Amino acid sequence: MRLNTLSPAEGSKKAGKRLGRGIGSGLGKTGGRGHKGQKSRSGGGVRRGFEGGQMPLYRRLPKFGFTSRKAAITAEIRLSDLAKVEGGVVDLNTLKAANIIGIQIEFAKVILAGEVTTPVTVRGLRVTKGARAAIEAAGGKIEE
Amino acid sequence: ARVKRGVIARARHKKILKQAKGYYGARSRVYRVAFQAVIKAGQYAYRDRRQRKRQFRQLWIARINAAARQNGISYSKFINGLKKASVEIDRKILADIAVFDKVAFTALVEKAKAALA
Amino acid sequence: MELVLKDAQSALTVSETTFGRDFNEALVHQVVVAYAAGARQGTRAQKTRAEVTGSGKKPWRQKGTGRARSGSIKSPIWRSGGVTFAARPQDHSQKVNKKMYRGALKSILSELVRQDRLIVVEKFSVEAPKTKLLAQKLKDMALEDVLIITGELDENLFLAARNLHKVDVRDATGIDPVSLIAFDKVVMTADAVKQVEEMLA
Amino acid sequence: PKIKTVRGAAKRFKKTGKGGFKHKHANLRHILTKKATKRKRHLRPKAMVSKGDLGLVIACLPYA
RNA sequence: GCUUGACUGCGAGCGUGACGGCGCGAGCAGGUGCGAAAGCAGGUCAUAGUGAUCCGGUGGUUCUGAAUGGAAGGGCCAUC
RNA sequence: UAGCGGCGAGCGAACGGGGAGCAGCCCAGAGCCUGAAUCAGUGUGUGUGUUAGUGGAAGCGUCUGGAAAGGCGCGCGAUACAGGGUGACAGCCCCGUACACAAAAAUGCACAUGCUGUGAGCUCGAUGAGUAGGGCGGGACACGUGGUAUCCUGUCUGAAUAUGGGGGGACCAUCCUCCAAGGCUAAAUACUCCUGACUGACCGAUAGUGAACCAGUACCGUGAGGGAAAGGCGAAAAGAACCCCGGCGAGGGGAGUGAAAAAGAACCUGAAACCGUGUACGUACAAGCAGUGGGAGCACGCUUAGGCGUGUGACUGCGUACCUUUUGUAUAAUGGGUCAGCGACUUAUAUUCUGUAGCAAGGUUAACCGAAUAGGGGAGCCGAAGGGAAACCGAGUCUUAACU
Numbered sequence A: 001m002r003l004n005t006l007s008p009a010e011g012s013k014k015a016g017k018r019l020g021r022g023i024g025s026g027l028g029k030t031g032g033r034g035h036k037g038q039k040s041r042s043g044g045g046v047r048r049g050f051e052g053g054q055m056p057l058y059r060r061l062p063k064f065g066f067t068s069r070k071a072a073i074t075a076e077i078r079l080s081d082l083a084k085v086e087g088g089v090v091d092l093n094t095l096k097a098a099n100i101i102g103i104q105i106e107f108a109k110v111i112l113a114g115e116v117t118t119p120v121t122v123r124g125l126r127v128t129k130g131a132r133a134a135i136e137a138a139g140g141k142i143e144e
Numbered sequence B: 001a002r003v004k005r006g007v008i009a010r011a012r013h014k015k016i017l018k019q020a021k022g023y024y025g026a027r028s029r030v031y032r033v034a035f036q037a038v039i040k041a042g043q044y045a046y047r048d049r050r051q052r053k054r055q056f057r058q059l060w061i062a063r064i065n066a067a068a069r070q071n072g073i074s075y076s077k078f079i080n081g082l083k084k085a086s087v088e089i090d091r092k093i094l095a096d097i098a099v100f101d102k103v104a105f106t107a108l109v110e111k112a113k114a115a116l117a
Numbered sequence C: 001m002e003l004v005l006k007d008a009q010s011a012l013t014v015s016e017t018t019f020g021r022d023f024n025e026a027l028v029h030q031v032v033v034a035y036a037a038g039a040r041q042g043t044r045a046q047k048t049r050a051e052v053t054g055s056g057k058k059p060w061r062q063k064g065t066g067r068a069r070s071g072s073i074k075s076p077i078w079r080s081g082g083v084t085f086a087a088r089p090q091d092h093s094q095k096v097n098k099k100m101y102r103g104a105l106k107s108i109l110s111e112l113v114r115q116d117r118l119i120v121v122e123k124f125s126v127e128a129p130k131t132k133l134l135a136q137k138l139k140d141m142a143l144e145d146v147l148i149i150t151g152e153l154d155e156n157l158f159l160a161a162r163n164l165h166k167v168d169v170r171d172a173t174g175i176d177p178v179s180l181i182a183f184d185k186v187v188m189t190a191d192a193v194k195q196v197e198e199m200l201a
Numbered sequence D: 001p002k003i004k005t006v007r008g009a010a011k012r013f014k015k016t017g018k019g020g021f022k023h024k025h026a027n028l029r030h031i032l033t034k035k036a037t038k039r040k041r042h043l044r045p046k047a048m049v050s051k052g053d054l055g056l057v058i059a060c061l062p063y064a
Numbered sequence E: 001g002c003u004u005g006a007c008u009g010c011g012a013g014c015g016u017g018a019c020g021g022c023g024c025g026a027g028c029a030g031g032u033g034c035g036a037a038a039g040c041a042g043g044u045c046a047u048a049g050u051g052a053u054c055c056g057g058u059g060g061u062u063c064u065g066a067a068u069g070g071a072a073g074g075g076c077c078a079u080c
Numbered sequence F: 001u002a003g004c005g006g007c008g009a010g011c012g013a014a015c016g017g018g019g020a021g022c023a024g025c026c027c028a029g030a031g032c033c034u035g036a037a038u039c040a041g042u043g044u045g046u047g048u049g050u051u052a053g054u055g056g057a058a059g060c061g062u063c064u065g066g067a068a069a070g071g072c073g074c075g076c077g078a079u080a081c082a083g084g085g086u087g088a089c090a091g092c093c094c095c096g097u098a099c100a101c102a103a104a105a106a107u108g109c110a111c112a113u114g115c116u117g118u119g120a121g122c123u124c125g126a127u128g129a130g131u132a133g134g135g136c137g138g139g140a141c142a143c144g145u146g147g148u149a150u151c152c153u154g155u156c157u158g159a160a161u162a163u164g165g166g167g168g169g170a171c172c173a174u175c176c177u178c179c180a181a182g183g184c185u186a187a188a189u190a191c192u193c194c195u196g197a198c199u200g201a202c203c204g205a206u207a208g209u210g211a212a213c214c215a216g217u218a219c220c221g222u223g224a225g226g227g228a229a230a231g232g233c234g235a236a237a238a239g240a241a242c243c244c245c246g247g248c249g250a251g252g253g254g255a256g257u258g259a260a261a262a263a264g265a266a267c268c269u270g271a272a273a274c275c276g277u278g279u280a281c282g283u284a285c286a287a288g289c290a291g292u293g294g295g296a297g298c299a300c301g302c303u304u305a306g307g308c309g310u311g312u313g314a315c316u317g318c319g320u321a322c323c324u325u326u327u328g329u330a331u332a333a334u335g336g337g338u339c340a341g342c343g344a345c346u347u348a349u350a351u352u353c354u355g356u357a358g359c360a361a362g363g364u365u366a367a368c369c370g371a372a373u374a375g376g377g378g379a380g381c382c383g384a385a386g387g388g389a390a391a392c393c394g395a396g397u398c399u400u401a402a403c404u
C-alpha cells in the first residue's frame, strides 16, 4: 500500500471519447456527426420539442387542471415515521421536530405505508382507515 | 499542460520517409508525397503477395509444357496422365526437374503416357 | 484485537473494524486521488479570440483576393490569435462522502497494522527543541521516514522535526490518508490511538 | 445553470407512477356538436403518452 | 302505423395510424321506444360532408377561493 | 417551483427556513435640569506597526573531470534541508533562511488623557398636504392590463389627519398588522490603476502580455485608429597578439585563447524543405501515378567454400495520386508549390443513462463555523405511495347514480 500501488476498481475509469483524432479511433473526420446538416454544424440542433415545424405535442394537446396551493402544505406520513418522534405523541408540530414533514406543512395525514410497533397517540391529524387500525392494533389513541 | 508536437511529429514523418528511400523526387524527400507512395506500395505488395503465387504457377506451367512438348506430350495430357498415375508432384517441382533433370522428366512423361494408354 | 506497544510489555485493545478491516483499494484510491485534486491551485488562463488584444476589423475583404477568407486577426487558426478553448481558473476539488473518507482511513490503518508500518508507543517525548535529540531517538528506534502522530502538539517535538524532511509530526486530528500511505512508518502515541478510534469508530 | 422546464409542456402532462405521462386528449375544446357522443366520451379520460413521444416530453420536462 | 336509441354513463377485445388521432365493437348499468313475443334500436347501406392548440364566450357545477367569510378569476362538465 | 408568456420562444419570483454580520438614532418644541452621553476635529502620553537595517549554525579527505557542489569515504549543524547563486547536482563556499535584535526623523491604526466646539436626562406637548388616493398616458414590480393588487409619475385632480389613515394581490366586510408624505447611520458586500510577500498538475520565445529585446516602438494611416518582427558565444572575454593571400578590403588560412572555435560574435543544441561536392550502380530504340512482384548484371562487405547482407537495378508481370464531395471521380470536379511550427468536440453548471465505489429504507449535506482536504453544520434535496383537475381519499384511487 504505497502511492504507486493504488489502482482504481476495474470498470470505474472509462477512457473518454476524443473526436477528430484520425482514422483508427473511429471518431475521425466528421467525429460521429455524419455529413452536412444542421446537426453536423457547431451549435447545431433544433430546440427541445421542435418536431420539424409540425405542431408539436406539448402544444397539439390541451392544457388541463390547476395547481392547488393546499397540496403544497399537506404531507403524507408513513407508520414507520410514528416511532421517529420524541414522546410517543404524534402532533403536526413534533413531526416537524423529527424532520418528517416540512416546516410549512399545516395538514398531515398518516397512511398505511410501513408498520408501527408501538403505542402511539396521534392528535390533530387525519388518519386513513387502514392506518387507523394499525395504530389501534398497537396501543393506539387517535384523538380528533 | 501545454504539449509541443515537434518530437513526435518528426518521428512520424521520419518513419514514412525512411520507408520511401529509393523513390524518385518528392517521393523520397517530401512527407505529403512520400506517405502516399508508401501506402500505395503497401497496397501493391499486399496485391503482389497474391499475384506472385499466380505468376510463379504461370511460369512453372509454361516450363512444364515446353519440356513435356519436347518429350512428346502437351501439358494438358501430361497432367492428366500424372493424375491417372496418382503422381502428386506439384508444378513447382516438375518445372525444376524439367530444367535441371531432363531424364527424370522423361521418366515422368513416360509414366503419364503409360497411364493414358 | 490488540496492538503491542513497541517500547512496552503492555498492549492496547482497539476496534477490529477500524484497525482490523479489509483493504478496499478502490475507496482508498478515490480518496487519495481526491486529496491530490483538493491540493491543486487551479490558477491559470489563456486568452480566447475575444480576450486577445486587437481589432475586430476584417484583415481583408471577403471576396476578390485569392486569400483564404478571414474575419479576425485573433482567430485561433492564426499565429498570435486566441486559444480555441482557452482555460479559465477552475476548482478541481472533489466531494468525498464523509463515510468514504473515514472508510478509507480505517482501511489504511488496518493495512498499516497488517504491514507492521504502525508503531505504537506510550509517549514520544523530546526534551529540548533540537533535531539532534530527535534524530538520535529515531536512529535508536530504527526509523528514518516516519509520520509521528501525537495526541497533543508538543512545541519541542514539532520544531525538532521541522528540519527533518522525512519526519512529519501531526496531532491526531491532523491525519490525512496520503501521509499515512506516503511515509514508511507511522508512529502513534497510545492516546492518539484513542482519539483516532473515537474519530473513526 | 439549471435546465429550464418547457412551461407549456408542464401544463399538458403529469408524471405517473411508472415514469409515464398522462395527458388530456385533443378534439374536445370546441366544435363538439357534430362529434358523436361515443367519440366525445372516449376523449374525456386522460390518455398516456405513446412510446414515440416520451423522448420529446422527457426532454421538455426534466424536473418532472 | 307508433314513436325519439340522432339515449346517458361505461366498455371485453380488435383494426388503422410515426404521433396527434381516427375507426369497429359485443356486453354491463341506468332509463326509453317499437313489437303479442323472440328481439331490434347508442342515428341514416357503407365508405366524403372537415380544423389541433392557444385565447376567449355562454350555461352548469358552493372543486379551488393568496389573513379569514365571501367574491373575482381559475378548474371540472356541457356547448360556442 | 408559483406564476408571467404571439401561454410561443423564453422570462421567473416570494413566503418561509439555514447562515455571514448586526446598532440604532435625530429633527419637525417647550420647560425644568445644563453642559453629564456621543462621534467630529485638534494637542499630548504610553504601547503597536510601517518607512532604512544588525547578528545569524556547521566540511574535510580522496576519484573522475576544464572545473566538483557529483562518486567514494569519514565527519558536523539544524526552531535554519525556504529559496537563489557559485566552473556539472552544496544543509555545512556565498547570499540568505529559522531564530533573535534594532530607529535619529516622519507617519499609520489602536488606547489613555487635555483644549475647543455638538448635546443628553427628565416632563408634557407635537407626529412631515398639492401629500395619500383618484382619472388619463406611460414605466417599474418574475407578473406582457389581464380578474391585477403594490411602487414611480408626465398630465388633470385631490382627502382624512389617531374618534384618523396605509397594507394584507380585483373588490367588500371583519380581524390582524403597521403609521407614508423629513432625515442620518458602522459591519457582513463589490472592485484592484498601484504596492509587498507567497503560491501554481499555468506559458516557456509562432507559447505566455501586442510587447522576455529601448514596444504601444518601428511601420501604416489626414485622422480616429491600426500595429509588428526581433531572446540564448563562453564558466570566465580568456572576444582571436602576431604571420600569410587580399584593395592599409570583404572574406579566408595559420598561430594563439579556451574543456570545446566541430562555441569566433552571421556565435548553445543546429531538424526539414531546398542547394551542392564526392564515390558506387544504373540511364542516349525509349512511351504513362514512377511503385509493386519477379529478376540478371555490377560494386561493396560477409562467409573459411554455401545459391545469404547492403547499394544500384537492365529486362519483365501487375498497376490512372491523395483529400473532399458524391448515385458515381484517374477524372478535364474541389483543396494543397514544399518543409517546419501552430491550427478544431472544450469548460462551467444543470439533468438523465451506464459503469464503478460507499452507505442503505434510508442516502447525502449546501452556505457557513472552523478545532481548515478533518470535524461540525441535515437548512434542504432525492427516495421509501399513489390516484385525482382539485377538495379529498389512500394500497388503493379516479371515473359514474353505481360498475360485470
Ligand SMILES: [Mg+2]
Residues within 6 Å of the ligand: A026
Ligand atoms: Mg466505421
Ligand SMILES: [Mg+2]
Residues within 6 Å of the ligand: A035, A036
Ligand atoms: Mg464534410
Ligand SMILES: [Mg+2]
Residues within 6 Å of the ligand: A035, A036
Ligand atoms: Mg446530404
Ligand SMILES: [Mg+2]
Residues within 6 Å of the ligand: A033, A034, A035, A036, A037, A039, A040
Ligand atoms: Mg445529419
Ligand SMILES: [Mg+2]
Residues within 6 Å of the ligand: A099, A102, A103
Ligand atoms: Mg427540516
Ligand SMILES: [Mg+2]
Residues within 6 Å of the ligand: C047, C052, C080, C081, C082, C083
Ligand atoms: Mg496568444
Ligand SMILES: [Mg+2]
Residues within 6 Å of the ligand: none
Ligand atoms: Mg465537510
Ligand SMILES: [Mg+2]
Residues within 6 Å of the ligand: D028, D029
Ligand atoms: Mg370547454
Ligand SMILES: [Mg+2]
Residues within 6 Å of the ligand: none
Ligand atoms: Mg339498455
Ligand SMILES: [Mg+2]
Residues within 6 Å of the ligand: none
Ligand atoms: Mg349513403
Ligand SMILES: [Mg+2]
Residues within 6 Å of the ligand: none
Ligand atoms: Mg365557472
Ligand SMILES: [Mg+2]
Residues within 6 Å of the ligand: E066
Ligand atoms: Mg386577500
Ligand SMILES: [Mg+2]
Residues within 6 Å of the ligand: none
Ligand atoms: Mg378570502
Ligand SMILES: [Mg+2]
Residues within 6 Å of the ligand: none
Ligand atoms: Mg431573486
Ligand SMILES: [Mg+2]
Residues within 6 Å of the ligand: none
Ligand atoms: Mg547581515
Ligand SMILES: [Mg+2]
Residues within 6 Å of the ligand: F056
Ligand atoms: Mg551564515
